[PDB]
């Protein structure tokens, strides 16, 4: 056989997390699964900026750090758009036809990453400066 068989390979405690993440989940549309990825990634990306920044004892350290976090999401919105134009040139088909194999819904993924990304950046801004 081609693939190696370790005793920890093909374990359902690990494979079960894969099939229920918003990248392999069966019921999600590309607008929904990009909204869930962005809401998780934007929530922790404002983590390192507000306590490790050029200004941390300021008015001021939480607002400007959260401004840098949405700055990364709108950068990674461009990279998700740039990866979409390159890897899906006419939405090149393949054998499996997922969202990631052939694109076919990819513009909804990049938009859903931007709403959930910039929202959860702003949502975690509410939980640090207030609440």
């Amino acid at each position: 056989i081609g693939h190696l068989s370790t005793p920890i390979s093909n374990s359902s405690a690990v494979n079960g997390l894969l099939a229920n993440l918003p990248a392999y989940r069966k019921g999600l549309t590309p607008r929904l699964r990009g909204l869930e990825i962005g809401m998780a990634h934007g929530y922790f990306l404002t983590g390192p900026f507000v306590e490790l920044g050029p200004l941390r004892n300021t008015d001021g350290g939480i607002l400007y750090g959260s401004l840098s976090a949405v700055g990364l999401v709108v950068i990674l919105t461009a990279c998700l758009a740039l990866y979409g134009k390159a890897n899906f040139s006419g939405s090149s088909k393949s054998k499996d036809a997922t969202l990631w194999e052939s694109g076919e819904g990819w513009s909804d993924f990049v938009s859903g990453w931007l709403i959930g990304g910039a929202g959860s950046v702003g949502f975690a801004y509410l939980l640090l400066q207030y609440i």
Partner: peptide, 30 residues
Amino acid sequence: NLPSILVPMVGIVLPAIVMALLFVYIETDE
């Protein structure tokens, strides 16, 4: 004053545009 506006444009914004323009140009095909 105009230094404060222009040096993040050609330092950050304009390289982000031309890298975006060159990357799609590389991976296009006929």
